[PDB]
């Protein structure tokens, strides 16, 4: 054997029932955006260059590999018609406000975590390069608590499956929020390194300070890059590739998990960044060039007309397949008005992240990376 890396094999996971799940009236988290993303992929003809699978509904036994039985059994039983009986237990598990109770809620968790664990065993069996599950990426879920629209943490479950055959796993979180659920689950171990780029300061979930580097055996294995409002493509690109490559050099993992939170795009309903799709997808290109078993997952994204743009192009990036900027016709062609074009343009907001601030945080994290 010889050679380095060429074109990669991709396995895509999607379930048709994922689009009908409804969080609530006026709730920003709309699972319908995944079906928009999948439908846009089909109309681009990208189904010819990838293997599409349907994820199984992950059983409660697979979920209890990280979560507790009290929290999992609660999710199986809670329904919109018997919430009053579970009023006290709804509050203990933070199920009610940001994480409301809707119809078929447990099945939605089974489809999300199913694609991540199915893609995990697919990578472990060495039958693909990248596994794509845009229904996953829910990174805020806790062991016995829900938060940030996340109920069951597919990422932690998918990484625990990778640990059966990969002694070191690298987790990358480009969601505008901090991956606090993934970071907390591996905060005291060196087998999993968590790296998260996020907006910090009076923003959900409040954690993510760069001074949190880990504890116990996992000290210096938790990298956080706090950011400010309105970061653009050049500011994100000048720090992503050098920091990711330094992690790949000092840590040298055997598997990568890249959470592609789309809420860090320009003009997001809940976000405040100013990234474009090309600037967002460039993060996938950097991780892809290292030629490691990658697990691409979804996550944030609340301007759904742009979420379908981002996760479609990033899928083509995984396929190394160029796609025209002119959007073809699709079932949801009305959402992409008034331009009906794939890529987007930045806003006029000010970049609160000065280039001198970007260099200082980068150099501060290089100090912790030398400690390996």
């Amino acid at each position: 054997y010889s050679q380095g890396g060429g074109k990669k094999k991709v396995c895509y996971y999607y379930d048709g029932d994922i689009g009908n799940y409804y969080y609530g009236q006026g709730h920003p988290m709309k699972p319908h955006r995944i079906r928009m993303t999948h439908n846009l992929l089909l109309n681009y003809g990208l189904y010819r260059k990838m293997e599409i699978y349907r994820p199984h509904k992950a059983t409660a036994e697979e979920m209890t590999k990280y979560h507790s039985d009290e929290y999992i059994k609660f999710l199986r039983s809670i329904r919109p018609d018997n919430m009053s009986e579970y009023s006290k237990q709804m509050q203990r598990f933070n199920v009610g406000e940001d994480c409301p109770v809707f119809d078929g809620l447990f099945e939605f968790c089974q489809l999300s975590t199913g694609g991540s664990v199915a893609g995990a065993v697919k990578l472990n069996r060495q039958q693909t390069d990248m596994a794509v599950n845009w229904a996953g990426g829910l990174h805020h879920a806790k062991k016995s608590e829900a938060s940030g629209f996340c109920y069951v943490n597919d990422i932690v479950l998918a990484i625990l499956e990778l640990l059966k055959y990969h002694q070191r796993v690298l987790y990358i979180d480009i969601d505008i929020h901090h991956g606090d659920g993934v970071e907390e689950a591996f905060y005291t171990t060196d087998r999993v390194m968590t790296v998260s780029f996020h907006k910090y300061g009076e923003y959900f979930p409040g954690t993510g300070d760069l001074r949190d580097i880990g504890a116990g055996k996992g000290k210096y294995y938790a990298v956080n890059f706090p950011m400010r409002d309105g970061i653009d493509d050049e500011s994100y690109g000048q720090i992503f590739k050098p920091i990711i490559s330094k992690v790949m050099e000092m840590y040298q993992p055997s598997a990568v998990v890249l959470q592609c939170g789309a809420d860090s795009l320009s003009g997001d309903r809940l976000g405040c960044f100013n990234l474009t799709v090309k600037g967002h997808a460039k993060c996938v290109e950097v991780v892809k060039t290292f030629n490691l078993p990658l697990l691409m997952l979804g996550g944030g994204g609340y301007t759904i007309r742009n979420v379908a743009r981002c996760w479609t192009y990033e899928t083509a990036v995984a396929l190394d397949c160029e796609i025209p900027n002119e959007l073809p016709y699709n079932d949801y062609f009305e959402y992409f008005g008034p331009d009906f074009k794939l890529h987007i343009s930045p806003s006029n907001m000010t970049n609160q992240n000065t280039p001198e601030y970007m260099e200082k945080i980068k150099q501060r994290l290089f100090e912790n990376l030398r400690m390996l």
Binding site: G26, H27, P28, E97, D98, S147, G148, F149, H177, F204, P205, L270
Partner: peptide, 8 residues
């Protein structure tokens, strides 16, 4: 998460 309502 939602700044429209709540603290998340």
């Amino acid at each position: 998460x939602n700044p429209k309502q709540x603290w998340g």
